[PDB]
Tab-separated table of C-alpha atoms in Angstrom:
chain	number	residue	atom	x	y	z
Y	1	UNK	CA	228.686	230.866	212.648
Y	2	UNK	CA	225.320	232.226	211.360
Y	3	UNK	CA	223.121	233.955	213.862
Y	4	UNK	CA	220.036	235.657	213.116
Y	5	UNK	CA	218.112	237.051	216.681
Y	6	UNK	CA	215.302	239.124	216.203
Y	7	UNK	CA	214.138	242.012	218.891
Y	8	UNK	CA	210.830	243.613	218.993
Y	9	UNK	CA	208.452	245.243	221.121
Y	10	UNK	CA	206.052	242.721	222.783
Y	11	UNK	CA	203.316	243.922	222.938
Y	12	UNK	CA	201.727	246.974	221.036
Y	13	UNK	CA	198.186	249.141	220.822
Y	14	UNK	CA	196.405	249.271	217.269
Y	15	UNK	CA	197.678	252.805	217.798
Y	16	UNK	CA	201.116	252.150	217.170
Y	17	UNK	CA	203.490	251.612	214.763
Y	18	UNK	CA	205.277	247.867	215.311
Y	19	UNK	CA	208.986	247.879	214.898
Y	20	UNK	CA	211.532	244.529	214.870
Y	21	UNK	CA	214.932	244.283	213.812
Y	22	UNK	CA	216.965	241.439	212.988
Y	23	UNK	CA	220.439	241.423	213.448
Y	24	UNK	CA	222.686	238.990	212.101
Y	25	UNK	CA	226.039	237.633	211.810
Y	26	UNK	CA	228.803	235.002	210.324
Y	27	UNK	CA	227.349	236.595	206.780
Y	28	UNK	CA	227.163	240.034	204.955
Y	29	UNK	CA	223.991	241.155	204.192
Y	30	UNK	CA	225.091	242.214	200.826
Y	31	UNK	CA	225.577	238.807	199.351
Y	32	UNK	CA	222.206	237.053	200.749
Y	33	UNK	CA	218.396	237.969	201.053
Y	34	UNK	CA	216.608	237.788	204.692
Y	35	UNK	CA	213.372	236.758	204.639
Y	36	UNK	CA	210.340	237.284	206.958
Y	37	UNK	CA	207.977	234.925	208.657
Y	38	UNK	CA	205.027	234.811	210.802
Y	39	UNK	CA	203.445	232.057	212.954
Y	40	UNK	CA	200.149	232.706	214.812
Y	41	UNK	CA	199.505	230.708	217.552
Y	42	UNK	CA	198.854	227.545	216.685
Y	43	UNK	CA	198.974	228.414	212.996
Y	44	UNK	CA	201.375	227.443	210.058
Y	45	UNK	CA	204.136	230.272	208.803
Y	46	UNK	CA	202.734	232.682	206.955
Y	47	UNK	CA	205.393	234.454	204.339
Y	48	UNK	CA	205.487	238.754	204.783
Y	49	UNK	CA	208.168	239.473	202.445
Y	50	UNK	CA	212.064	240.014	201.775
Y	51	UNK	CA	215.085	242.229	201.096
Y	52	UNK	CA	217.201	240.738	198.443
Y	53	UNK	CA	221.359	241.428	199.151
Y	54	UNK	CA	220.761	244.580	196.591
Y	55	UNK	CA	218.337	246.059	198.817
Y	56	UNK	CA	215.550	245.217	196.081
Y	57	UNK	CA	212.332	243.826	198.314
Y	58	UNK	CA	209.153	241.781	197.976
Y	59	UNK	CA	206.000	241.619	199.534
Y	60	UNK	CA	202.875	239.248	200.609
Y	61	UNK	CA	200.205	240.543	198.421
Y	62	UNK	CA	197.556	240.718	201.071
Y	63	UNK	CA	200.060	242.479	203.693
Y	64	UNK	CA	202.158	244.618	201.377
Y	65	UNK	CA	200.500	248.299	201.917
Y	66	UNK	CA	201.290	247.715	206.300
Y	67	UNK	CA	204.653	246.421	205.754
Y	68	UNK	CA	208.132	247.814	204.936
Y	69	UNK	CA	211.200	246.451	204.986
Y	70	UNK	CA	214.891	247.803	205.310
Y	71	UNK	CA	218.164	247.047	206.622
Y	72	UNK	CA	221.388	248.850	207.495
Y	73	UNK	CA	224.698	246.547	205.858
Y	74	UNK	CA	227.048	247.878	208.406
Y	75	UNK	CA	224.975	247.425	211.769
Y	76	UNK	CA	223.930	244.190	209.955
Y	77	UNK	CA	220.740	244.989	210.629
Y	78	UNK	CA	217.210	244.229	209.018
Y	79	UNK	CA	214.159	245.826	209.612
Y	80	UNK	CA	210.139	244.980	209.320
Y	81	UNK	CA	207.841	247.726	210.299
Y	82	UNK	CA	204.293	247.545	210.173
Y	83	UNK	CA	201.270	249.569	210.855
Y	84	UNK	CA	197.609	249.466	210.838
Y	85	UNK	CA	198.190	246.602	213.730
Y	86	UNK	CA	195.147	244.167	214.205
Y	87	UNK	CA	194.552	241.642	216.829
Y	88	UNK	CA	195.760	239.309	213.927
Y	89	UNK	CA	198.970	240.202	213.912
Y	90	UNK	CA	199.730	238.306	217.140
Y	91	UNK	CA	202.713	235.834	216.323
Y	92	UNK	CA	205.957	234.867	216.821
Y	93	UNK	CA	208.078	236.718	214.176
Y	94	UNK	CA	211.155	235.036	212.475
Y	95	UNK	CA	213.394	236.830	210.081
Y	96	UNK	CA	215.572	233.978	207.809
Y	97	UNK	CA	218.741	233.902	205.925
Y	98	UNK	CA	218.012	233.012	202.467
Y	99	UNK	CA	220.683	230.934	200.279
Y	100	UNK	CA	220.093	230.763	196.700
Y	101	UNK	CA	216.093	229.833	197.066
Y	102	UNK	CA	216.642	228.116	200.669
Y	103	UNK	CA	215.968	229.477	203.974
Y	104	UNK	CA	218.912	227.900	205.331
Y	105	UNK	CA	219.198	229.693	208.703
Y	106	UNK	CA	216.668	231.080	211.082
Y	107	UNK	CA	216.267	233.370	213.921
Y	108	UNK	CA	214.213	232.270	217.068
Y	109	UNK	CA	211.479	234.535	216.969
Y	110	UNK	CA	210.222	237.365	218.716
Y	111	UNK	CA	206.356	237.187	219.781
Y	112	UNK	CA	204.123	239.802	219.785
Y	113	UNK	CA	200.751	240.753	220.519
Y	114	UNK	CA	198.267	242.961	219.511
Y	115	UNK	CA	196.221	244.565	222.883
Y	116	UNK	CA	193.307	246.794	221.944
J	1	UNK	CA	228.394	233.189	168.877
J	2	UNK	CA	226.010	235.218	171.156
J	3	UNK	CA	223.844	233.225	172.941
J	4	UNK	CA	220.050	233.994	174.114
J	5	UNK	CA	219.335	233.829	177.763
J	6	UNK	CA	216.789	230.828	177.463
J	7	UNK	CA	219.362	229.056	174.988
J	8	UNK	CA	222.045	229.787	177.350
J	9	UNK	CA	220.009	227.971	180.172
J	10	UNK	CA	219.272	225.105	178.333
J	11	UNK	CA	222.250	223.848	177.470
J	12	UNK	CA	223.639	224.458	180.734
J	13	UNK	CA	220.795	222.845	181.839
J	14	UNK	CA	221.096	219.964	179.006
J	15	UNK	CA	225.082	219.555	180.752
J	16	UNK	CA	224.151	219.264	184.419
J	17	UNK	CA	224.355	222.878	185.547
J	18	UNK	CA	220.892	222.566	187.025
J	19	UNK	CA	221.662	222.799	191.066
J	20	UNK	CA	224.940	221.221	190.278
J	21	UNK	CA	226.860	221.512	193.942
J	22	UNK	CA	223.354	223.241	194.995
J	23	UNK	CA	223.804	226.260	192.740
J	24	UNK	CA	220.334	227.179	191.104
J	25	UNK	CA	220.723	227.495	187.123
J	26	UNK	CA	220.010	231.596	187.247
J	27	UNK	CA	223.429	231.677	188.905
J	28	UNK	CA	225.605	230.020	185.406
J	29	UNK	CA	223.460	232.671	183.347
J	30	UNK	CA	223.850	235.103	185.269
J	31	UNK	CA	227.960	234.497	185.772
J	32	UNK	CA	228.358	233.896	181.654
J	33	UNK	CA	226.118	237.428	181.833
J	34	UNK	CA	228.929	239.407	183.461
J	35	UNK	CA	231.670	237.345	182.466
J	36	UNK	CA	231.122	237.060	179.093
J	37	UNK	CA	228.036	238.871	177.987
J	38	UNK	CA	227.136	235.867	176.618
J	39	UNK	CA	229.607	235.549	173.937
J	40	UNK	CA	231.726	232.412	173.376
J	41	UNK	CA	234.744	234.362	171.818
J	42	UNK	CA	234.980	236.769	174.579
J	43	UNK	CA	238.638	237.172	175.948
J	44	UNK	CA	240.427	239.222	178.293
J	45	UNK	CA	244.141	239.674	178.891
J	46	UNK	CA	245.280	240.610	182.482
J	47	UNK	CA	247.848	242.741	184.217
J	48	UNK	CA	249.992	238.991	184.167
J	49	UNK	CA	250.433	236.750	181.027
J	50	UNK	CA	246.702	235.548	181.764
J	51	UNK	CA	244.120	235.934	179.440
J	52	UNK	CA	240.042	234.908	180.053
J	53	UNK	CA	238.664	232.606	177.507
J	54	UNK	CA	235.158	231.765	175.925
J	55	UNK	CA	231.683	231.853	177.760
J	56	UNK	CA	232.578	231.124	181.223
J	57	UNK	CA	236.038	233.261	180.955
J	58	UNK	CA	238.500	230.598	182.449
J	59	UNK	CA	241.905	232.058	183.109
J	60	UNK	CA	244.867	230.625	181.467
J	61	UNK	CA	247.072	230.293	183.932
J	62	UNK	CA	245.434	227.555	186.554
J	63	UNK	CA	242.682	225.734	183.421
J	64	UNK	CA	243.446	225.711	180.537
J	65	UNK	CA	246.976	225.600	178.130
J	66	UNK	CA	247.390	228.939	175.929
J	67	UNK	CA	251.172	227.902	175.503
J	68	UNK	CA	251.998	231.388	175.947
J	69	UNK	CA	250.748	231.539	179.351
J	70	UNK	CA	253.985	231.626	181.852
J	71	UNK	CA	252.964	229.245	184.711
J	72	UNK	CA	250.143	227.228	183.214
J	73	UNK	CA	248.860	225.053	185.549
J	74	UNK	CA	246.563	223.005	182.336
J	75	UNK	CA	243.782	221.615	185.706
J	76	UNK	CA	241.258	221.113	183.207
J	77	UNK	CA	243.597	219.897	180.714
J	78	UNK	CA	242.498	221.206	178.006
J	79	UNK	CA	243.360	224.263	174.923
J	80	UNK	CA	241.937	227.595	175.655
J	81	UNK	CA	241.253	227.415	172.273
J	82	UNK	CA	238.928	224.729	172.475
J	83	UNK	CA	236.776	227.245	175.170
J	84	UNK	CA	236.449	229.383	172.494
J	85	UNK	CA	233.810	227.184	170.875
J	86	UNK	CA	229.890	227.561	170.243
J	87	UNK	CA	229.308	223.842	171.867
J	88	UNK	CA	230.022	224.953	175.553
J	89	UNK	CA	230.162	221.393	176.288
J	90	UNK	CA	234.243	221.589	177.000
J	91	UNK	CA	234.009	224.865	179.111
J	92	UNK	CA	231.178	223.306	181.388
J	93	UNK	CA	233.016	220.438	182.235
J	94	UNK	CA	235.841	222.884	183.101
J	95	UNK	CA	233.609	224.839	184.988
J	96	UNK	CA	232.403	221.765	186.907
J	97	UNK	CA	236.040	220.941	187.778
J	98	UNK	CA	236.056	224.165	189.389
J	99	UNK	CA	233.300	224.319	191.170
J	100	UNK	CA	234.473	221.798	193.480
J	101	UNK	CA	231.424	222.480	196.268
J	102	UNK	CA	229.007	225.066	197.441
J	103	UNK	CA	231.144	228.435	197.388
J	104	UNK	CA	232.950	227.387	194.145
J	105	UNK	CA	231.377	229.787	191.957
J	106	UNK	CA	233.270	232.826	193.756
J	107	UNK	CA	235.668	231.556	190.899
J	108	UNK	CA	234.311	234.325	189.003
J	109	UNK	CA	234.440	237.624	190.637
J	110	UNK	CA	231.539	238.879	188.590
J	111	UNK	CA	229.143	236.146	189.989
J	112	UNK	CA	230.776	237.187	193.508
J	113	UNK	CA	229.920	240.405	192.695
J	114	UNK	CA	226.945	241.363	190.547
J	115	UNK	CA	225.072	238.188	190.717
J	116	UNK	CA	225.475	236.217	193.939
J	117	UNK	CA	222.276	237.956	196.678
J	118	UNK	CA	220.333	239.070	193.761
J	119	UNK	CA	217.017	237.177	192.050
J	120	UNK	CA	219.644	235.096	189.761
J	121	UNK	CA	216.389	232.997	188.952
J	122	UNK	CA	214.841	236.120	187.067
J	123	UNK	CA	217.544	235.178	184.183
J	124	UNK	CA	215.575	231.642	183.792
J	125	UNK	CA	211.900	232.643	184.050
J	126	UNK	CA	209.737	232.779	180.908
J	127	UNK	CA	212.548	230.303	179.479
J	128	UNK	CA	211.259	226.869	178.126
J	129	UNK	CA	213.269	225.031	180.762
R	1	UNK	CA	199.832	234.252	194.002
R	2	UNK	CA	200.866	230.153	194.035
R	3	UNK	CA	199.051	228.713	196.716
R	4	UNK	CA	200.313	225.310	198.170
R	5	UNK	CA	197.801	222.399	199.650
R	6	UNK	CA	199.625	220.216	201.774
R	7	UNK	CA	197.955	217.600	203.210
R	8	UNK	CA	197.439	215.286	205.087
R	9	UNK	CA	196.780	218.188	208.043
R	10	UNK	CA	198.270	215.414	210.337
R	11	UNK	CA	199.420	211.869	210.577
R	12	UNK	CA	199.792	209.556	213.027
R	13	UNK	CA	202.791	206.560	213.147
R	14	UNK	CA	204.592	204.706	215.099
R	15	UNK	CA	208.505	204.373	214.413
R	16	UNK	CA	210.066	202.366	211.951
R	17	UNK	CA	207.022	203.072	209.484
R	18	UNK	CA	207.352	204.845	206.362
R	19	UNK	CA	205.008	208.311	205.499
R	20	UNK	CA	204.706	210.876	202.962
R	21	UNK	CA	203.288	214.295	203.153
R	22	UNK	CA	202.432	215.987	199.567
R	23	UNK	CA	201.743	219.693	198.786
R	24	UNK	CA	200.328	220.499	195.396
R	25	UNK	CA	201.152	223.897	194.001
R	26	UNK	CA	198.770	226.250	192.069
R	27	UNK	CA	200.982	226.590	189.185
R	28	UNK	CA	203.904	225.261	188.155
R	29	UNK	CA	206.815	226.019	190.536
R	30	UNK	CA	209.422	224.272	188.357
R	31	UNK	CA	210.954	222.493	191.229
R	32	UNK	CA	211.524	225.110	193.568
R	33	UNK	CA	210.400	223.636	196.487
R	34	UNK	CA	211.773	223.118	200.254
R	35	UNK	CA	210.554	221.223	203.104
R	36	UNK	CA	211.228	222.253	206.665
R	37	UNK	CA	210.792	220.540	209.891
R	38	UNK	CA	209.735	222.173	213.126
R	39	UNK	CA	209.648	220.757	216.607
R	40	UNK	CA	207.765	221.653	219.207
R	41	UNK	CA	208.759	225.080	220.652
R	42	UNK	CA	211.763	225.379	217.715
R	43	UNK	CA	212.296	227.375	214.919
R	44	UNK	CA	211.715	225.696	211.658
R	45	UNK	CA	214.550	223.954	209.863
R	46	UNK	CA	215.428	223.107	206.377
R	47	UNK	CA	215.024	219.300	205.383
R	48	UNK	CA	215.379	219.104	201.486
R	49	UNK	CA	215.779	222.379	198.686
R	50	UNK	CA	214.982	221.987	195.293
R	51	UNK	CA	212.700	219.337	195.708
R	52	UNK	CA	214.784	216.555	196.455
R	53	UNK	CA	218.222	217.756	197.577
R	54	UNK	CA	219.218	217.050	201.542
R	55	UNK	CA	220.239	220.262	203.687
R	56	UNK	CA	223.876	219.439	204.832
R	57	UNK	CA	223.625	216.892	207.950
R	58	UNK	CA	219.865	215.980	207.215
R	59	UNK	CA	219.778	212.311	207.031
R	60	UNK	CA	218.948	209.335	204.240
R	61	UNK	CA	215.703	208.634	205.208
R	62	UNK	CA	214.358	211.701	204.206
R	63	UNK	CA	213.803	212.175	200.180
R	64	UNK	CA	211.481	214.779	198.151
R	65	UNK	CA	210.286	214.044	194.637
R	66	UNK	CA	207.447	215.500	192.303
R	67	UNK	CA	208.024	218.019	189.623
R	68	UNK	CA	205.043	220.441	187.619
R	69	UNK	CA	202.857	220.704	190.492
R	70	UNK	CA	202.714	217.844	193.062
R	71	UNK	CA	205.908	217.300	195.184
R	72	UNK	CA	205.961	214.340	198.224
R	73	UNK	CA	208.073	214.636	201.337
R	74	UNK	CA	208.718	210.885	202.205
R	75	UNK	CA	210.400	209.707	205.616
R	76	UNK	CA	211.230	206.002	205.641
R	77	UNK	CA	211.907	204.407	209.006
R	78	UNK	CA	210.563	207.659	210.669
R	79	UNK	CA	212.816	207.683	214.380
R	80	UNK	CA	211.313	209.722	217.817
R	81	UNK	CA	213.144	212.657	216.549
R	82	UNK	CA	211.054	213.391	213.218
R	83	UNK	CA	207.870	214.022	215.296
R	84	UNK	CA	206.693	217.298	214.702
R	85	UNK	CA	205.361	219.671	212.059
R	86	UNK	CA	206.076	219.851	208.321
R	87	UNK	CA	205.878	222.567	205.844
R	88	UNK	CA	206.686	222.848	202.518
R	89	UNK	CA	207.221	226.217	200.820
R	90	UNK	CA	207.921	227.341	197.157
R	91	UNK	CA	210.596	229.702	195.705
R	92	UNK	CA	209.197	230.434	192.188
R	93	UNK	CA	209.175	233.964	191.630
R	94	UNK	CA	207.380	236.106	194.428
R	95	UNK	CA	205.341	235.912	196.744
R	96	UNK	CA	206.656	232.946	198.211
R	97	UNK	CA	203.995	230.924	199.999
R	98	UNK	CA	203.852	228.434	202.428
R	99	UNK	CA	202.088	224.729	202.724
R	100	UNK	CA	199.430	224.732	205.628
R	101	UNK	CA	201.513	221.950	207.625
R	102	UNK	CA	201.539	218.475	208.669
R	103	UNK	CA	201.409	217.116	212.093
R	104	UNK	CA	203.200	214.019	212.441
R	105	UNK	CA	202.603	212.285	215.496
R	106	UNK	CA	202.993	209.298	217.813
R	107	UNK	CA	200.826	206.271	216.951
């Protein structure tokens, strides 16, 4: 069975440093990429990047200097951590299994949201 | 014959290769890559009677007749020597009777291994289809 | 980067009609395209990879098509089940964006 569930903080002050793992399962992390995803509210999904099952990762252009992204294979764990948090960073946050050019398999989300 | 990348990828994509049981066409260049650094004379005996022919390396035991192979199974029936050819034609219709559905290609171990959760599409790009 | 317009921003039917949402990509994303559906309250859910190939236990009356630049999602006989929100995204190289969505709703 595939499972992807994502954790996070909640909510989090500009002066912090936002933190959300995604742990999966039914799949090693070393044969398939996990994406992540972003939905304000009310918005579409809006792409922040991936780690490929070598470890390689991409970015969003726009979002790439805030955002880093790592995983652990044997906790089959990924992570996304961010900084320089704005109020438009509120979302629900999805991390997704990627097959061969497919997100085939998603977590439900975590939402967060930027206070002041 | 050593093939180029971009030649290699269009004639697997001329033969169907393209997506064929969902598998993206970076994933075939990227097998024949590790399997056969794109050469269609490469062989490779194993630790058993078995020897890896041609492009795709397909083992002589379970594909295709060596007739020197004890236990040949022939399920492509067809001549290992006719995988050894610079038309892949015959080895990607053996390949496609492997690859009977969507985890198939962990018939090669190399895919499995050095190709299968890495940006197999970076093999294809630049390539004139 | 490869931006995708998808339009139209929403639709409205009634069931047993026939729709089609489109997204047209910046540059040419040689087929590497996917459609997902998401319901209200739902995470979103792959519909069709590749531009026209069905996710396992997605049904018939969904098909994609388009190649180059413009790709179509079309869902014939839409049931009460395909209300909801459609995005199409591309895998060509990276970033990978997303379509702005389509609302599909009840006529």
């Amino acid at each position: 069975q595939v499972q992807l569930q994502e954790s996070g903080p909640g909510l989090v002050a500009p002066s912090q440093s936002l933190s959300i793992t995604c742990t999966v399962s039914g799949f090693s992390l070393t044969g398939a990429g996990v994406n992540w995803v972003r939905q304000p509210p009310g918005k579409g999904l809006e792409w922040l990047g991936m780690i490929w099952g070598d470890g390689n990762t991409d970015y969003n252009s726009a979002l790439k200097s805030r955002l880093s992204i790592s995983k652990d294979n044997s906790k089959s764990q990924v992570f996304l951590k961010m900084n320089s948090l704005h109020t438009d960073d509120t979302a629900r946050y999805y991390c997704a299994r990627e097959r061969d050019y497919r997100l085939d398999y998603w977590g439900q989300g975590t939402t967060l949201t930027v206070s002041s | 014959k050593v093939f180029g990348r971009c030649e290699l990828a269009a004639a697997m994509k001329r033969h169907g290769l393209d997506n064929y049981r969902g598998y993206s066409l970076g994933n075939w260049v990227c097998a024949a890559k590790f399997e056969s650094n794109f050469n269609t004379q490469a062989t490779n005996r194993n630790t058993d009677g078995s020897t890896d022919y041609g492009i795709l390396q397909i083992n002589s035991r379970w594909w295709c007749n060596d007739g020197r192979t004890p236990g040949s199974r022939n399920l492509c029936n067809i001549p290992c020597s006719a995988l050894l050819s610079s038309d892949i034609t015959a080895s990607v219709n053996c390949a496609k009777k492997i690859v009977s559905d969507g985890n198939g290609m962990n018939a090669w171990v190399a895919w499995r291994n050095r190709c299968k959760g890495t940006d197999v599409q970076a093999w294809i790009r630049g390539c004139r289809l | 980067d490869i931006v995708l317009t998808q339009s139209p921003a929403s639709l409205s039917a009634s069931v047993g009609e026939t729709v089609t949402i489109t997204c047209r990509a910046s540059g040419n994303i040689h087929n590497y395209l996917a459609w997902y559906q998401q319901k209200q309250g739902k995470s979103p859910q792959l519909l069709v990879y590749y531009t026209t190939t069905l996710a396992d236990g997605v049904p018939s009356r969904f098909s994609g098509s388009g190649s180059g630049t413009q790709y179509s999602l079309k869902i014939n006989s839409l049931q009460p089940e395909d209300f909801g929100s459609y995005y199409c995204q591309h895998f060509w190289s990276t970033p990978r964006t997303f379509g702005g969505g389509t609302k599909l709703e009840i006529k």
